[PDB]
């Protein structure tokens, strides 16, 4: 009934609110995508384009919520780049053990950080794992978490090591399914990391629109922005 271009006009305000709160680079990407939806000849184009807005915007608010840097996909570091710059003395071995699984070197998580020392820096990795584990324990939110560990080694108090934090996030209906497949994907490289004596933590989580607005991995004020924009776009897309 409603043409799609007309559908975008109606939600001009909610989408304006959305672009204004997103980080700068995330905002512009969502603004290009929005015009692709307005100028969409087919309802499959519009849908696929709206799927990208749902994920990209959500990531922008995940960055804001956690005070991490939003990284456009084009500029996201892979694992190989992380090992090379952060652990340069192990990269050659990191290349040898990936001879049979070369896709590992090209794994690109949503966030690839390291403890303060294009890998982003964070002051404490253990605190990020705790905050994830806390909310999982408190609101029943499904996560998966893994830590590399050479042999059965103990943590130590007389020296500091470099370490990575690998985080995957998502906005999609099958929350359980997302974290299981994410952790299955990274399990191989965790084991590789144990064998190279590199400390990594892998975290994965997801939200969906049925998640109570106080319980998401993003601030509730951002939950409201997504529900009032990207979620009404999807509902109006199907009906008309």
């Amino acid at each position, epitope marked *: 009934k409603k043409p799609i271009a007309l559908i975008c006009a109606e939600l001009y305000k909610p989408f304006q609110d959305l672009f204004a709160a997103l980080p700068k680079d995330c905002s512009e990407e969502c603004q290009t995508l929005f015009e692709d939806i307005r100028n969409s000849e087919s309802h499959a184009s519009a849908w696929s384009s709206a799927l990208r807005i749902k994920g990209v915007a959500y990531e922008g608010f995940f960055s804001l919520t956690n005070s991490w840097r939003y990284i456009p996909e084009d500029l996201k570091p892979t694992l190989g780049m992380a090992i090379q710059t952060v652990f340069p003395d192990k990269f050659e071995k990191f290349l040898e053990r990936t001879h049979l699984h070369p896709e590992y070197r090209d794994f690109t998580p949503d966030y690839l950080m390291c403890r303060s020392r294009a890998v982003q820096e964070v002051s404490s990795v253990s605190a990020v794992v705790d905050r994830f584990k806390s909310k999982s324990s408190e609101k029943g939110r499904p996560i998966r978490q893994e830590e590399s560990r050479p*042999k059965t*080694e*103990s943590m*130590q108090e*007389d*020296i500091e*090591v470099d370490e990575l934090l690998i985080v995957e996030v998502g906005y999609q209906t099958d929350i359980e399914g997302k974290v299981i497949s994410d952790i299955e994907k990274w399990k191989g490289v965790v084991n590789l990391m144990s064998h190279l*004596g590199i400390k990594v933590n892998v975290l994965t989580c997801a939200d969906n629109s049925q998640t109570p607005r106080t319980d998401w991995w993003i601030d509730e004020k951002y939950v409201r922005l997504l529900l009032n924009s990207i979620s009404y776009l999807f509902k109006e897309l199907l009906e008309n």
Partner: antibody
Framework: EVKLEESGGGLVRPGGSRKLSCAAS????????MQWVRQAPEKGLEWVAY????????YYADTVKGRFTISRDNPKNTLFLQMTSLRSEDTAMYYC???????????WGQGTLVTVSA | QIVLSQSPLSLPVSLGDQASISCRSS???????????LHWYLQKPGQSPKLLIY???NRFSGVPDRFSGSGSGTDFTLKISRVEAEDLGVYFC?????????FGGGTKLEIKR
């Protein structure tokens, strides 16, 4: 001077429970991991449990897992060991210890004796 | 578990003589951070244990310099260069590279007479 001072020992029936405490002084307790070690009479030393400075990392000897809980209270410079489901094989001198900079046992208390028997 | 094997079980030694105690590990104690967490303790009769040497060869502050440690990987040695009467007691090695932390079974230093 660094000093560690255990208390809470005594006699426990098998299956019983008992909490030990270790009061620490002479160093900034909250910055260091703390440990429990025990020694059955006329036997060698046996590591029990470790707890990191901020309690985030805890390790247990396999023979106490699921029965013993280690914890600390940093504002009160006190280390705890909660023992439950005690067995006569848990009879031992219990020592708290710290590396004061590492995971080795640099500083030791005088120990407290726990006897598990009916 | 890491198994630590001390030899000899007992060591009779004359005052003034050197003593050597061996601790072997069932796997390497080199930690991935580059350190090697093998340590030596002395327990005098009726006392709690005291640290002598931490990470293979670092003498603990205040320990007499007759005590030294050496080795690497799975093979480590405590040496007493010149035994004194107060050195009577049980010597233990222990490792904290892997969990569980484990002790050797002890060497009893006996004074010859």
């Amino acid at each position: 001077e660094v000093k560690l001072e255990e208390s809470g020992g005594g006699l426990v029936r098998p299956g019983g429970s008992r909490k030990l405490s270790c009061a620490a002084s002479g160093f900034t307790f909250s910055s260091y991991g703390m440990q429990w070690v025990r020694q059955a009479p006329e036997k060698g030393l046996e590591w029990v449990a470790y707890i990191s400075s901020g309690s985030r990392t805890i390790y247990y000897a396999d023979t106490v897992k699921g029965r013993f809980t280690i914890s600390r209270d940093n504002p009160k410079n006190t280390l705890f060991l909660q023992m439950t489901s005690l067995r006569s094989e848990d009879t031992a001198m219990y020592y708290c210890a710290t590396g004061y900079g590492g995971t080795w046992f640099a500083y030791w208390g005088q120990g407290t004796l726990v006897t598990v028997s009916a | 578990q890491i198994v630590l094997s001390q030899s000899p079980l007992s060591l009779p030694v004359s005052l003034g003589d050197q003593a050597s105690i061996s601790c072997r590990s069932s796997q390497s104690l080199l930690h991935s951070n580059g350190n090697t967490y093998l340590h030596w303790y002395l327990q005098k009769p009726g006392q709690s244990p005291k640290l002598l040497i931490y990470k293979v060869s670092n003498r603990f502050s205040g320990v007499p310099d007759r005590f030294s440690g050496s080795g690497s990987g799975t093979d480590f040695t405590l040496k007493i260069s010149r035994v004194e009467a107060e050195d009577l007691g049980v010597y233990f090695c222990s490792q904290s590279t892997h969990v569980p932390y484990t002790f050797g079974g002890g060497t009893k230093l006996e004074i010859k007479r």
